[PDB]
Amino acid sequence: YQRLRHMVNDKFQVRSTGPVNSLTMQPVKGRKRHGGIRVGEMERDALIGHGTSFLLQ
Amino acid sequence: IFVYQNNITPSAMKLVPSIPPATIETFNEAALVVNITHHELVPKHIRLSSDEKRELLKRYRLKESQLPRIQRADPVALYLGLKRGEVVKIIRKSETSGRYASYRICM
Amino acid sequence: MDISKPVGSEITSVDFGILTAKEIRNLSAKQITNPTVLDNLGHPVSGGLYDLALGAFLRNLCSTCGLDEKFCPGHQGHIELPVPCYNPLFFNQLYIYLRASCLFCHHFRLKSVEVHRYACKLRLLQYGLIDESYKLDEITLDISSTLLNELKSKRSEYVDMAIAKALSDGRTTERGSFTATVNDERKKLVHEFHKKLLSRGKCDNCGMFSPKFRKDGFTKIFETALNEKQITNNRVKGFIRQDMISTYILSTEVKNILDTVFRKEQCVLQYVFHSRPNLSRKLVKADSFFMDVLVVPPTRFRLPSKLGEEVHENSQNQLLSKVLTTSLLIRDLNDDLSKLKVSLEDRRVIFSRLMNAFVTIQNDVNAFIDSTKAQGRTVPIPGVKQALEKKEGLFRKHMMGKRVNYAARSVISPDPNIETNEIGVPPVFAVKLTYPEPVTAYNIAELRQAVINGPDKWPGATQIQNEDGSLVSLIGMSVEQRKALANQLLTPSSNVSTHTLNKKVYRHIKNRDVVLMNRQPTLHKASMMGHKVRVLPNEKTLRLHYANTGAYNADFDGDEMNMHFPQNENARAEALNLANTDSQYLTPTSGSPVRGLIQDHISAGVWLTSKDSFFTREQYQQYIYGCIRPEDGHTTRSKIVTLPPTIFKPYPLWTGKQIITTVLLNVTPPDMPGINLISKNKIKNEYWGKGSLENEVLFKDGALLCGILDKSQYGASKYGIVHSLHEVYGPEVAAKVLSVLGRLFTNYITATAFTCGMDDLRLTAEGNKWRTDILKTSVDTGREAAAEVTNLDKDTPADDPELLKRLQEILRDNNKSGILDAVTSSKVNAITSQVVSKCVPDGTMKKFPCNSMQAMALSGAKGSNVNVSQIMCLLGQQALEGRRVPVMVSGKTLPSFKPYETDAMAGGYVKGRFYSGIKPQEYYFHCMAGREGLIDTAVKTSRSGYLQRCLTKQLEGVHVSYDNSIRDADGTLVQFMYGGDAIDITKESHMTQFEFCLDNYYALLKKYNPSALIEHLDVESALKYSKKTLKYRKKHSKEPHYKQSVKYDPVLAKYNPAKYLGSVSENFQDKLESFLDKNSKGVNEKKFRALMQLKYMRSLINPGEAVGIIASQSVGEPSTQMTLNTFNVTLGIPRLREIVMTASAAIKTPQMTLPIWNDVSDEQADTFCKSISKVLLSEVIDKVIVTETTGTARSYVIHMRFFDNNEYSEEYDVSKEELQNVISNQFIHLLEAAIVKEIKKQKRTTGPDIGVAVPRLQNSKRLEEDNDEEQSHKKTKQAVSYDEPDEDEIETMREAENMNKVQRDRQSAIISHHRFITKYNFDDESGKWCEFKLELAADTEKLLMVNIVEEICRKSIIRQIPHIDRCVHPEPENGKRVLVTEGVNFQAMWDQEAFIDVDGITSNDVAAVLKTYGVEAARNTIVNEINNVFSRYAISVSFRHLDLIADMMTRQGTYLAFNRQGMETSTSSFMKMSYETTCQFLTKAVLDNEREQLDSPSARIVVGKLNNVGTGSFDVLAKVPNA
Ligand SMILES: [Zn+2]
Ligand SMILES: [Zn+2]
């Protein structure tokens, strides 16, 4: 057996309330900077899909 | 109804909507060779009365324009001789429900 | 968001307008005049971009609101432009009105009566009345002013009357009616108006010509001088003026021209610039297109960017400083201009100084708004337009999508010990993710402990929010302070202003919480479900159960998942009851399951439910409690009930099937009876021995009495045990059964393991003998097939010289080699099938159930019988791109094989298996075929990203209304009923499973409880009507669809399905009645009818359901499975793009399906195919001999040697007479034109230019990355949107909107019609040749006639029916006799009534069908064609989705595509802005003075309003008792 060099859990992160950008006042990008997870257009579409208006809100 | 052979003069074509309330409809005999409403993919289109339209706009609380559209120059619209505002009832066979009644407003 | 902080005011609508200079000057906090931003020492300079009046900056307090950097919102300022500038966004418009106006009378050059006609039509369109706008054109009486003014009066009279009449009724409000069709009619007119305006040259009011205005890329206008014809026109029309009493043009001159024109033409512009009536009565002024001031945004939005230590200057301040420098310079130029002047004459300099001053400030203004409109500086600084469209845009990157709080990301790891509805949360996430729990009397005990525990001990609390609004962090505090605060949580509020409020505790995520699990790409809503939190100690990864693997399309190969923690109870309820996993058992695409057990559990079940599996009391009870724990709420009886043993004497023993009966007996409700199901298995009875019935899955009163359980029962497979349980007992029970089975099989695999080894790969000595004997015949097959294709009798030897010459002919032709490959492959594959059929399983040493390799393939746990046969028998023929192994120019397939070797092995046929090994020749050939697939995965540009993105943005608003109809976001009707029956796809499964429903009558009668419904519905109205429609339907059964009765329309059209028992689809009615007739079986045939009627009632789609998104997701998500290439017509994503994305009128493969009669025979139809198929001269010619002889004149003797007369007449249906006409009329005229063109081309260019250069013949690391490297980056990237169209889509989007006497007379007549021929003799008797002589001049010299003739022959058409290339006769499709055409022309096929049924002539071309047969026919073509794309890839998509998509494309009565063009006719400008060209759609909105009603999902997201779909489709009101 061979052990492959890659450590897959390198992008492991958690954020409750971290820093925000001045213009958008939205969670800033950056795992190590206590950054936010992006909820993109597709996830927006999925939340419209379930008809789950408060989850989108 | 004026069934022409090959073509109509551009000057003569201007005389068509010149005498209201009388309406003039032009058709090429080559285009009338086969009836389009006889085709399997063309459902039964029925022109509704001013009262039938009035009732439909009430049941769904719709405004004339808020309905699905049929062009005034659409082959079936030209066949039944539809005017702007006239609502047409379409009984179409569905491969989920069977006979289904849908509607379209001619604008 | 704080529930303790409610909001009483709300934004209902947004109005788009232009800021006036006077308006900005009043609201401005400070006038910005200084280009410097900081004084010396470090304080902001007074009158600069960092002035404290614009807000708090550099630890200084704001000089306007007095607050510090935190609480100060920032304040707007202004720059006073020394000269007016053209606003870049509205330059194109002011340009249109400048070119359209007269420079003398200062009116538009178009006649006033024509202008009034547009003003009238546009006023009537402010209100929803299109019919009246067209009826205005009917109002009709070089024409006198007294007559024309009467026409304007009569038109105005009709406009005022039509508005008042419609206003009296509910046709239009005072604010005016506005629909997409109304908008379409407005957009058409405003376009036509500007087109007529720009067309006029000479002014129709005063006959004087105006000087034409030209423009450049940048905002700058010039005036082209008039021609002498127009200058003399000004002179002769100069006297009539008296009786009534290229050069650059400045911004002021243009503003002054438009000022008077906008005053004089105010009436039309009032309706040109207002979408709805102008109730504000504001004047339409020209100065709206000009900028006399610039607003300075607050310091808050212009802060300098800090990256580590370096503090970088803000790019907007830089652009603003440039505007300030130029303004100070023009103030000095105007000051020097004010000084001096008596001395003038040379005024060419003062205007030159002015032109520079104007063009410089304009450029600085342009550079600030839109950089791509400013001059090149030796990448420029981005403008405000660039800021809104940086990449995807501000709307897409920061409004439609956002980075969120209370969320986590981690690699997923598998776990069978957690519930199928749960998520294993690492304690790392549990101590950080908190919920704001308000402290009350019922939870004071629970939260006091959390407070004591603190932020590092789970279940704890990170913070506590007091009723005053302040926060108290528990992070730094010790156990002593936390204990004190806990005893202060339920203290009454002293302050009367906060007595209403109670404290909040920001408590750790507990095991009772909901979380949103997301696995990107989120192609369908099942990829974003609600999971129950289960905090697992000593964990560093997110643990997920195997049942979730399908829906997320997540494999535990190092995948990543996003966890979202919603922070309020309304969001909780939604993630637990709507988006929760258990409510996502069936996908809405086909209504089939996406939840089930995957590998070990399937193999475990086949062993556990086997007859041979017996268990003692101790073993049996252990397996029960192992998977069912009453303490975890798994039971329904509060005591584990157990069945008696199946064997009493000698020893008490329980069967394996009894464990499955006991699990159901404890998880299904006691009040309901047991499940009754007769299903089947994947494993055939033959494997279980003689007379076994172990394939028949039998459940009688919730007891497994016969058959084992496969992937077909507790996998994600329709009509299995789990699905049957789901229909009878609900989704919660089915989820419990899945988790229970999942545990049982995990525990069973721990006690009783499952393995795979070499013994499972071996054949017996008998079985291996069969293998060698069948493969012994394969040696002859190679040469046999080679002798068949080559056509050689008695089967010639392999080394035959004639055969080897014949095989060479095959080698050089791609088609000939194809025939050889397909024949040899079919023959060797027949030998393969024989080996496999004999050896597996009757020849395997170890056999099922013990042979685990065989078991895994049969159970559906993993692998197939094909993989099993490659392992134990042979790999077979290695197929490469549909053919065999590639062959070299030498005729060798490898250097080891003989040239033109007639052997199966040489062609790639592998006799070897993976167990015994494969030979080097076979190894290399296997390497070829193995790689071939991976190469196809590398070359596949087709992506479903943009296709889905285009559908979802146009369908987001489309949902189910409370009146059961499918309505868009703006209330416009799309469908009158969902699929014409209003059924939810996730319910339409057992609705036709009548036998199932009958066997479970009392179980379902208890489910669909009618006792609490009989008082709310009607039991006869619809049932009586259903009989009346059935009566008239049976009367006109044999009658055609056009002659059918229209007396009574369907029962669903007249009676509400949720209120009237019996208002069912005629499809369901016919199917149900047919079952009761064909099956006569204490349930009556009348009481069963009621139950099924009630089942349909309970299967209705819920009002609020986003059927729009669901439809696009149901078309998008499965279109990812058709990314692979063909194994003629366009298929997969390219064909789907031709329909949905582009709605092409020019299809790649246009076809026509012609239904042939019964009276027309197979020979007659093939003759008819030949009669329509395009015939070329090339197709009938065998040889052409050109005898170039130069005498006296270049003589060219062209002899056309055709095939035999009977040969081409039987192959193309072409006569000798037909050949004569084409050569004598077409071919010679085409040949003469080609020779003349070749003589000109020879004399034109003598040769190429020597020394002069000619044109050349013909991310890097990203393309050099393997799959494991490329997928490692996608693994971590959190997607902005759907894939990307950067492929073929970008190039498709690159398109904007001695001779006989009779023979002598014939020759002489042809000589008079052709300038170069002398002789013309044609075979009239036999019809085999055509000879003609061509005479050329002495100066024509050398020419390549053969090559010239050749090209014209394949260009000459003998017979062709317009737009049709070839008519073929395929195999009858599902019993229907049809002919497939490679072209579209209905009118031509209409003449073939004797052969074709003109009422059944199908065509794939939607636009062609629409043009001839109408919108409804095109609509039917869309639903059929999209279905053909999916049915080919064996993908089932519900017609309810396709019908909705087709109805949306045909909503305007035309064929609209899901793109920028189709979208133009949509109410929401915010939806449009968030799609593409944000500033362009915004400009159109402002110019229309549009009101965004905030009714589209996109618009609501922009303004932070709750979406009107699902839970937002109603309002919640509280019932209060006191008066
Ligand atoms: Zn302030
Ligand atoms: Zn004029």
Swiss-Prot record, chain A:
It is found in: Nucleus, Nucleolus. DNA-dependent RNA polymerases catalyze the transcription of DNA into RNA using the four ribonucleoside triphosphates as substrates. Component of RNA polymerase I (Pol I) which synthesizes ribosomal RNA precursors. Besides, RNA polymerase I has intrinsic RNA cleavage activity. RPA190 and RPA135 both contribute to the polymerase catalytic activity and together form the Pol I active center. In addition, subunit RPA12 contributes a catalytic zinc ribbon that is required for RNA cleavage by Pol I. Three distinct zinc-containing RNA polymerases are found in eukaryotic nuclei: polymerase I for the ribosomal RNA precursor, polymerase II for the mRNA precursor, and polymerase III for 5S and tRNA genes. Component of the RNA polymerase I (Pol I) complex consisting of 14 subunits: RPA135, RPA190, RPC40, RPA14, RPB5, RPO26, RPA43, RPB8, RPA12, RPB10, RPC19, RPC10, RPA49 and RPA34. The complex is composed of a horseshoe-shaped core containing ten subunits (RPA135, RPA190, RPB5, RPO26, RPB8, RPB10, RPC10, RPA12, RPC19 and RPC40) where RPA135 and RPA190 form the DNA-binding cleft. Outside of the core, RPA14 and RPA43 form the stalk that mediates interactions with transcription initiation factors and newly synthesized RNA. Belongs to the RNA polymerase beta chain family. This is DNA-directed RNA polymerase I subunit RPA135. It comes from Saccharomyces cerevisiae (strain ATCC 204508 / S288c) (Baker's yeast).
Swiss-Prot record, chain B:
Keywords: DNA-binding, DNA-directed RNA polymerase, Nucleus, Ribosome biogenesis, Transcription. It is found in: Nucleus. GO terms for biological process: nucleolar large rRNA transcription by RNA polymerase I; ribosome biogenesis; RNA-templated transcription; termination of RNA polymerase I transcription; termination of RNA polymerase III transcription; transcription by RNA polymerase I; transcription by RNA polymerase II; transcription by RNA polymerase III. GO terms for cellular component: nucleoplasm; nucleus; RNA polymerase I complex; RNA polymerase II, core complex; RNA polymerase III complex. The keyword Lipoprotein does not apply. One of its GO terms (molecular function) is DNA-directed RNA polymerase activity. Belongs to the archaeal Rpo5/eukaryotic RPB5 RNA polymerase subunit family. Component of the RNA polymerase I (Pol I), RNA polymerase II (Pol II) and RNA polymerase III (Pol III) complexes. Component of the RNA polymerase I (Pol I) complex consisting of 14 subunits: RPA135, RPA190, RPC40, RPA14, RPB5, RPO26, RPA43, RPB8, RPA12, RPB10, RPC19, RPC10, RPA49 and RPA34. The complex is composed of a horseshoe-shaped core containing ten subunits (RPA135, RPA190, RPB5, RPO26, RPB8, RPB10, RPC10, RPA12, RPC19 and RPC40) where RPA135 and RPA190 form the DNA-binding cleft. DNA-dependent RNA polymerases catalyze the transcription of DNA into RNA using the four ribonucleoside triphosphates as substrates. Common component of RNA polymerases I, II and III which synthesize ribosomal RNA precursors, mRNA precursors and many functional non-coding RNAs, and small RNAs, such as 5S rRNA and tRNAs, respectively. Pol II is the central component of the basal RNA polymerase II transcription machinery. RNA polymerase complexes are composed of mobile elements that move relative to each other. The gene is RPB5. The chain holds residues 109 to 215 of 215 of the full protein.
Curated annotation (Swiss-Prot), chain C:
Zn(2+) 2 binds at residues 102, 105, 203, 206. One of its GO terms (biological process) is transcription elongation by RNA polymerase I. DNA-dependent RNA polymerases catalyze the transcription of DNA into RNA using the four ribonucleoside triphosphates as substrates. Component of RNA polymerase I (Pol I) which synthesizes ribosomal RNA precursors. Besides, RNA polymerase I has intrinsic RNA cleavage activity. RPA190 and RPA135 both contribute to the polymerase catalytic activity and together form the Pol I active center. In addition, subunit RPA12 contributes a catalytic zinc ribbon that is required for RNA cleavage by Pol I. GO terms for cellular component: mitochondrion; nucleolus; nucleus; RNA polymerase I complex. Belongs to the RNA polymerase beta' chain family. Component of the RNA polymerase I (Pol I) complex consisting of 14 subunits: RPA135, RPA190, RPC40, RPA14, RPB5, RPO26, RPA43, RPB8, RPA12, RPB10, RPC19, RPC10, RPA49 and RPA34. The complex is composed of a horseshoe-shaped core containing ten subunits (RPA135, RPA190, RPB5, RPO26, RPB8, RPB10, RPC10, RPA12, RPC19 and RPC40) where RPA135 and RPA190 form the DNA-binding cleft. Outside of the core, RPA14 and RPA43 form the stalk that mediates interactions with transcription initiation factors and newly synthesized RNA. Present with 2840 molecules/cell in log phase SD medium. It is found in: Nucleus, Nucleolus. This is DNA-directed RNA polymerase I subunit RPA190. Its EC number is 2.7.7.6. Residues 920-932 are annotated as: Bridging helix. It catalyses: RNA(n) + a ribonucleoside 5'-triphosphate = RNA(n+1) + diphosphate. Residues 1249-1297 are annotated as: Disordered. Gene3D superfamilies: 1.10.132.30, 1.10.150.390, 1.10.357.120, 2.40.40.20, 3.30.70.2850, RNA polymerase ii, RNA polymerase II, clamp domain, RNA polymerase Rpb1, domain 3. It comes from Saccharomyces cerevisiae (strain ATCC 204508 / S288c). One of its GO terms (molecular function) is DNA-directed RNA polymerase activity. The keyword Transcription applies. Zn(2+) 1 binds at residues 62, 65, 72, 75. Mg(2+) binds at residues 555, 557, 559.
